[PDB]
Amino acid sequence: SQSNRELVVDFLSYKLSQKGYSWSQFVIPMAAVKQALRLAGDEFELRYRRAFSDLTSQLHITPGTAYQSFEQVVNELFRDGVNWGRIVAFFSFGGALCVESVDKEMQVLVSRIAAWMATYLNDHLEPWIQENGGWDTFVELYG
């Protein structure tokens, strides 16, 4: 919850920096988890460059968008359940949403998206993560 919050912020900050944007609107194995996640995300966006076009448009985020709408859209990535690659897609998707928000002069949504991701991670993804090795297995797999 606290760790996950930090993890989400780091990945989103990484993505924004990398793409020329500001991250101002915002390490035990943690440092290792963070780096593994940064690498996983880059590899992902490398193979898939569509940038979640339909998912973001299906969501069309504005300052009035509620978590439930975010949650419903994100659920689409997990229609067949959770797996590591889908978790990576989840982070990449949040990253795309932040970029889009900045491109629309709605930089105020980045901290909100981060909060939503942490909530979604703790609620829907940690159960599977903890059952399949925890973030140690993730590092072991993408580190």
PDB file of N, CA and C in Angstrom, residues 39-96:
ATOM      1  N   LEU A  39      12.481  -1.433 -16.578  1.00  0.00           N
ATOM      2  CA  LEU A  39      12.943  -2.250 -17.699  1.00  0.00           C
ATOM      3  C   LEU A  39      11.787  -3.011 -18.353  1.00  0.00           C
ATOM      4  N   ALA A  40      10.942  -3.615 -17.523  1.00  0.00           N
ATOM      5  CA  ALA A  40       9.789  -4.365 -18.016  1.00  0.00           C
ATOM      6  C   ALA A  40       8.924  -3.455 -18.875  1.00  0.00           C
ATOM      7  N   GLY A  41       8.648  -2.260 -18.362  1.00  0.00           N
ATOM      8  CA  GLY A  41       7.821  -1.316 -19.088  1.00  0.00           C
ATOM      9  C   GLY A  41       8.395  -0.910 -20.433  1.00  0.00           C
ATOM     10  N   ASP A  42       9.695  -0.650 -20.476  1.00  0.00           N
ATOM     11  CA  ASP A  42      10.332  -0.255 -21.727  1.00  0.00           C
ATOM     12  C   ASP A  42      10.220  -1.384 -22.755  1.00  0.00           C
ATOM     13  N   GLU A  43      10.516  -2.600 -22.322  1.00  0.00           N
ATOM     14  CA  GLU A  43      10.439  -3.758 -23.205  1.00  0.00           C
ATOM     15  C   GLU A  43       9.010  -3.900 -23.731  1.00  0.00           C
ATOM     16  N   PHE A  44       8.029  -3.705 -22.850  1.00  0.00           N
ATOM     17  CA  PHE A  44       6.621  -3.819 -23.230  1.00  0.00           C
ATOM     18  C   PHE A  44       6.219  -2.824 -24.311  1.00  0.00           C
ATOM     19  N   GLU A  45       6.490  -1.548 -24.057  1.00  0.00           N
ATOM     20  CA  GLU A  45       6.141  -0.488 -24.993  1.00  0.00           C
ATOM     21  C   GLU A  45       6.923  -0.614 -26.291  1.00  0.00           C
ATOM     22  N   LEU A  46       8.004  -1.381 -26.237  1.00  0.00           N
ATOM     23  CA  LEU A  46       8.843  -1.614 -27.398  1.00  0.00           C
ATOM     24  C   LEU A  46       8.100  -2.565 -28.343  1.00  0.00           C
ATOM     25  N   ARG A  47       7.542  -3.637 -27.784  1.00  0.00           N
ATOM     26  CA  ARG A  47       6.799  -4.617 -28.574  1.00  0.00           C
ATOM     27  C   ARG A  47       5.391  -4.130 -28.912  1.00  0.00           C
ATOM     28  N   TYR A  48       4.775  -3.387 -27.999  1.00  0.00           N
ATOM     29  CA  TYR A  48       3.433  -2.855 -28.226  1.00  0.00           C
ATOM     30  C   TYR A  48       3.496  -1.333 -28.207  1.00  0.00           C
ATOM     31  N   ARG A  49       3.248  -0.704 -29.350  1.00  0.00           N
ATOM     32  CA  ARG A  49       3.301   0.750 -29.429  1.00  0.00           C
ATOM     33  C   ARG A  49       1.942   1.415 -29.637  1.00  0.00           C
ATOM     34  N   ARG A  50       0.866   0.633 -29.610  1.00  0.00           N
ATOM     35  CA  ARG A  50      -0.464   1.201 -29.809  1.00  0.00           C
ATOM     36  C   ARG A  50      -0.833   2.184 -28.700  1.00  0.00           C
ATOM     37  N   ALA A  51      -0.121   2.098 -27.576  1.00  0.00           N
ATOM     38  CA  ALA A  51      -0.324   2.985 -26.427  1.00  0.00           C
ATOM     39  C   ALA A  51      -1.709   2.959 -25.773  1.00  0.00           C
ATOM     40  N   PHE A  52      -2.416   1.835 -25.881  1.00  0.00           N
ATOM     41  CA  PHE A  52      -3.742   1.701 -25.275  1.00  0.00           C
ATOM     42  C   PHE A  52      -4.741   2.735 -25.801  1.00  0.00           C
ATOM     43  N   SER A  53      -4.748   2.915 -27.118  1.00  0.00           N
ATOM     44  CA  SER A  53      -5.637   3.872 -27.775  1.00  0.00           C
ATOM     45  C   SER A  53      -7.107   3.727 -27.388  1.00  0.00           C
ATOM     46  N   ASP A  54      -7.670   2.541 -27.597  1.00  0.00           N
ATOM     47  CA  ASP A  54      -9.075   2.326 -27.280  1.00  0.00           C
ATOM     48  C   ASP A  54      -9.375   2.410 -25.785  1.00  0.00           C
ATOM     49  N   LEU A  55      -8.494   1.866 -24.951  1.00  0.00           N
ATOM     50  CA  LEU A  55      -8.721   1.915 -23.509  1.00  0.00           C
ATOM     51  C   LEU A  55      -8.778   3.349 -22.977  1.00  0.00           C
ATOM     52  N   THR A  56      -7.848   4.197 -23.413  1.00  0.00           N
ATOM     53  CA  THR A  56      -7.842   5.580 -22.946  1.00  0.00           C
ATOM     54  C   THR A  56      -9.038   6.346 -23.507  1.00  0.00           C
ATOM     55  N   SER A  57      -9.359   6.109 -24.777  1.00  0.00           N
ATOM     56  CA  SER A  57     -10.490   6.791 -25.399  1.00  0.00           C
ATOM     57  C   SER A  57     -11.776   6.292 -24.754  1.00  0.00           C
ATOM     58  N   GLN A  58     -11.784   5.016 -24.385  1.00  0.00           N
ATOM     59  CA  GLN A  58     -12.936   4.407 -23.735  1.00  0.00           C
ATOM     60  C   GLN A  58     -13.113   5.035 -22.356  1.00  0.00           C
ATOM     61  N   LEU A  59     -12.023   5.584 -21.827  1.00  0.00           N
ATOM     62  CA  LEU A  59     -12.041   6.211 -20.514  1.00  0.00           C
ATOM     63  C   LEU A  59     -12.161   7.731 -20.573  1.00  0.00           C
ATOM     64  N   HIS A  60     -11.532   8.338 -21.581  1.00  0.00           N
ATOM     65  CA  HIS A  60     -11.517   9.796 -21.761  1.00  0.00           C
ATOM     66  C   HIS A  60     -11.487  10.466 -20.393  1.00  0.00           C
ATOM     67  N   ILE A  61     -10.296  10.538 -19.812  1.00  0.00           N
ATOM     68  CA  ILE A  61     -10.139  11.109 -18.487  1.00  0.00           C
ATOM     69  C   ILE A  61     -10.176  12.635 -18.387  1.00  0.00           C
ATOM     70  N   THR A  62     -10.969  13.108 -17.433  1.00  0.00           N
ATOM     71  CA  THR A  62     -11.117  14.528 -17.152  1.00  0.00           C
ATOM     72  C   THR A  62     -11.084  14.633 -15.633  1.00  0.00           C
ATOM     73  N   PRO A  63     -10.944  15.854 -15.100  1.00  0.00           N
ATOM     74  CA  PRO A  63     -10.906  16.040 -13.644  1.00  0.00           C
ATOM     75  C   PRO A  63     -12.159  15.526 -12.933  1.00  0.00           C
ATOM     76  N   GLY A  64     -13.195  15.204 -13.700  1.00  0.00           N
ATOM     77  CA  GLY A  64     -14.422  14.714 -13.099  1.00  0.00           C
ATOM     78  C   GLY A  64     -14.538  13.200 -13.115  1.00  0.00           C
ATOM     79  N   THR A  65     -13.602  12.541 -13.785  1.00  0.00           N
ATOM     80  CA  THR A  65     -13.615  11.085 -13.873  1.00  0.00           C
ATOM     81  C   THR A  65     -13.456  10.477 -12.478  1.00  0.00           C
ATOM     82  N   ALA A  66     -14.251   9.453 -12.179  1.00  0.00           N
ATOM     83  CA  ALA A  66     -14.182   8.784 -10.880  1.00  0.00           C
ATOM     84  C   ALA A  66     -13.386   7.478 -10.970  1.00  0.00           C
ATOM     85  N   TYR A  67     -12.896   7.011  -9.825  1.00  0.00           N
ATOM     86  CA  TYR A  67     -12.114   5.778  -9.762  1.00  0.00           C
ATOM     87  C   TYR A  67     -12.808   4.587 -10.419  1.00  0.00           C
ATOM     88  N   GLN A  68     -14.089   4.414 -10.117  1.00  0.00           N
ATOM     89  CA  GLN A  68     -14.882   3.316 -10.659  1.00  0.00           C
ATOM     90  C   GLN A  68     -14.780   3.203 -12.184  1.00  0.00           C
ATOM     91  N   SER A  69     -14.712   4.342 -12.864  1.00  0.00           N
ATOM     92  CA  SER A  69     -14.591   4.347 -14.318  1.00  0.00           C
ATOM     93  C   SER A  69     -13.200   3.835 -14.690  1.00  0.00           C
ATOM     94  N   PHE A  70     -12.189   4.311 -13.972  1.00  0.00           N
ATOM     95  CA  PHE A  70     -10.816   3.871 -14.200  1.00  0.00           C
ATOM     96  C   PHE A  70     -10.781   2.351 -13.979  1.00  0.00           C
ATOM     97  N   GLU A  71     -11.252   1.923 -12.811  1.00  0.00           N
ATOM     98  CA  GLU A  71     -11.282   0.507 -12.451  1.00  0.00           C
ATOM     99  C   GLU A  71     -11.949  -0.369 -13.510  1.00  0.00           C
ATOM    100  N   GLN A  72     -13.100   0.068 -14.017  1.00  0.00           N
ATOM    101  CA  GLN A  72     -13.828  -0.695 -15.035  1.00  0.00           C
ATOM    102  C   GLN A  72     -13.026  -0.852 -16.317  1.00  0.00           C
ATOM    103  N   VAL A  73     -12.352   0.216 -16.724  1.00  0.00           N
ATOM    104  CA  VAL A  73     -11.543   0.166 -17.933  1.00  0.00           C
ATOM    105  C   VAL A  73     -10.326  -0.742 -17.727  1.00  0.00           C
ATOM    106  N   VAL A  74      -9.620  -0.557 -16.611  1.00  0.00           N
ATOM    107  CA  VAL A  74      -8.431  -1.357 -16.310  1.00  0.00           C
ATOM    108  C   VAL A  74      -8.761  -2.852 -16.237  1.00  0.00           C
ATOM    109  N   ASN A  75      -9.952  -3.171 -15.726  1.00  0.00           N
ATOM    110  CA  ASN A  75     -10.410  -4.555 -15.617  1.00  0.00           C
ATOM    111  C   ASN A  75     -10.317  -5.266 -16.971  1.00  0.00           C
ATOM    112  N   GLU A  76     -10.425  -4.500 -18.051  1.00  0.00           N
ATOM    113  CA  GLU A  76     -10.345  -5.059 -19.400  1.00  0.00           C
ATOM    114  C   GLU A  76      -9.029  -5.809 -19.622  1.00  0.00           C
ATOM    115  N   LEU A  77      -7.959  -5.322 -19.002  1.00  0.00           N
ATOM    116  CA  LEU A  77      -6.641  -5.942 -19.145  1.00  0.00           C
ATOM    117  C   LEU A  77      -6.578  -7.279 -18.434  1.00  0.00           C
ATOM    118  N   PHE A  78      -7.512  -7.488 -17.513  1.00  0.00           N
ATOM    119  CA  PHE A  78      -7.525  -8.701 -16.717  1.00  0.00           C
ATOM    120  C   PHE A  78      -8.754  -9.584 -16.902  1.00  0.00           C
ATOM    121  N   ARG A  79      -9.341  -9.548 -18.089  1.00  0.00           N
ATOM    122  CA  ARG A  79     -10.525 -10.360 -18.360  1.00  0.00           C
ATOM    123  C   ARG A  79     -10.205 -11.849 -18.237  1.00  0.00           C
ATOM    124  N   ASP A  80      -8.948 -12.223 -18.475  1.00  0.00           N
ATOM    125  CA  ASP A  80      -8.542 -13.619 -18.347  1.00  0.00           C
ATOM    126  C   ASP A  80      -7.695 -13.780 -17.077  1.00  0.00           C
ATOM    127  N   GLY A  81      -7.857 -12.855 -16.141  1.00  0.00           N
ATOM    128  CA  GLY A  81      -7.100 -12.947 -14.908  1.00  0.00           C
ATOM    129  C   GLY A  81      -5.759 -12.238 -14.980  1.00  0.00           C
ATOM    130  N   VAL A  82      -5.050 -12.272 -13.861  1.00  0.00           N
ATOM    131  CA  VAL A  82      -3.752 -11.631 -13.729  1.00  0.00           C
ATOM    132  C   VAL A  82      -2.550 -12.505 -14.094  1.00  0.00           C
ATOM    133  N   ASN A  83      -1.522 -11.866 -14.650  1.00  0.00           N
ATOM    134  CA  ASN A  83      -0.232 -12.502 -14.919  1.00  0.00           C
ATOM    135  C   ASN A  83       0.753 -11.343 -14.939  1.00  0.00           C
ATOM    136  N   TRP A  84       2.046 -11.647 -14.869  1.00  0.00           N
ATOM    137  CA  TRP A  84       3.087 -10.622 -14.829  1.00  0.00           C
ATOM    138  C   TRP A  84       3.052  -9.634 -15.986  1.00  0.00           C
ATOM    139  N   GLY A  85       2.868 -10.151 -17.198  1.00  0.00           N
ATOM    140  CA  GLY A  85       2.828  -9.283 -18.368  1.00  0.00           C
ATOM    141  C   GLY A  85       1.656  -8.311 -18.321  1.00  0.00           C
ATOM    142  N   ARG A  86       0.541  -8.762 -17.753  1.00  0.00           N
ATOM    143  CA  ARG A  86      -0.641  -7.928 -17.653  1.00  0.00           C
ATOM    144  C   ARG A  86      -0.435  -6.845 -16.596  1.00  0.00           C
ATOM    145  N   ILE A  87       0.311  -7.172 -15.545  1.00  0.00           N
ATOM    146  CA  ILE A  87       0.626  -6.211 -14.497  1.00  0.00           C
ATOM    147  C   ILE A  87       1.509  -5.131 -15.143  1.00  0.00           C
ATOM    148  N   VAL A  88       2.482  -5.556 -15.947  1.00  0.00           N
ATOM    149  CA  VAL A  88       3.356  -4.605 -16.628  1.00  0.00           C
ATOM    150  C   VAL A  88       2.505  -3.703 -17.539  1.00  0.00           C
ATOM    151  N   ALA A  89       1.526  -4.292 -18.227  1.00  0.00           N
ATOM    152  CA  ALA A  89       0.648  -3.521 -19.107  1.00  0.00           C
ATOM    153  C   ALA A  89      -0.131  -2.489 -18.279  1.00  0.00           C
ATOM    154  N   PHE A  90      -0.547  -2.895 -17.088  1.00  0.00           N
ATOM    155  CA  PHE A  90      -1.277  -2.028 -16.172  1.00  0.00           C
ATOM    156  C   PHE A  90      -0.446  -0.766 -15.883  1.00  0.00           C
ATOM    157  N   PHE A  91       0.827  -0.956 -15.558  1.00  0.00           N
ATOM    158  CA  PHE A  91       1.695   0.180 -15.277  1.00  0.00           C
ATOM    159  C   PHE A  91       1.898   1.033 -16.521  1.00  0.00           C
ATOM    160  N   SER A  92       2.145   0.383 -17.656  1.00  0.00           N
ATOM    161  CA  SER A  92       2.346   1.090 -18.916  1.00  0.00           C
ATOM    162  C   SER A  92       1.101   1.898 -19.278  1.00  0.00           C
ATOM    163  N   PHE A  93      -0.064   1.322 -19.006  1.00  0.00           N
ATOM    164  CA  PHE A  93      -1.328   1.992 -19.277  1.00  0.00           C
ATOM    165  C   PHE A  93      -1.436   3.256 -18.415  1.00  0.00           C
ATOM    166  N   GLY A  94      -1.114   3.142 -17.127  1.00  0.00           N
ATOM    167  CA  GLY A  94      -1.177   4.307 -16.258  1.00  0.00           C
ATOM    168  C   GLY A  94      -0.237   5.381 -16.784  1.00  0.00           C
ATOM    169  N   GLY A  95       0.925   4.943 -17.265  1.00  0.00           N
ATOM    170  CA  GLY A  95       1.893   5.866 -17.824  1.00  0.00           C
ATOM    171  C   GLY A  95       1.313   6.591 -19.029  1.00  0.00           C
ATOM    172  N   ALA A  96       0.626   5.856 -19.903  1.00  0.00           N
ATOM    173  CA  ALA A  96       0.030   6.455 -21.097  1.00  0.00           C
ATOM    174  C   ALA A  96      -1.029   7.478 -20.702  1.00  0.00           C
TER     175      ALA A  96
END
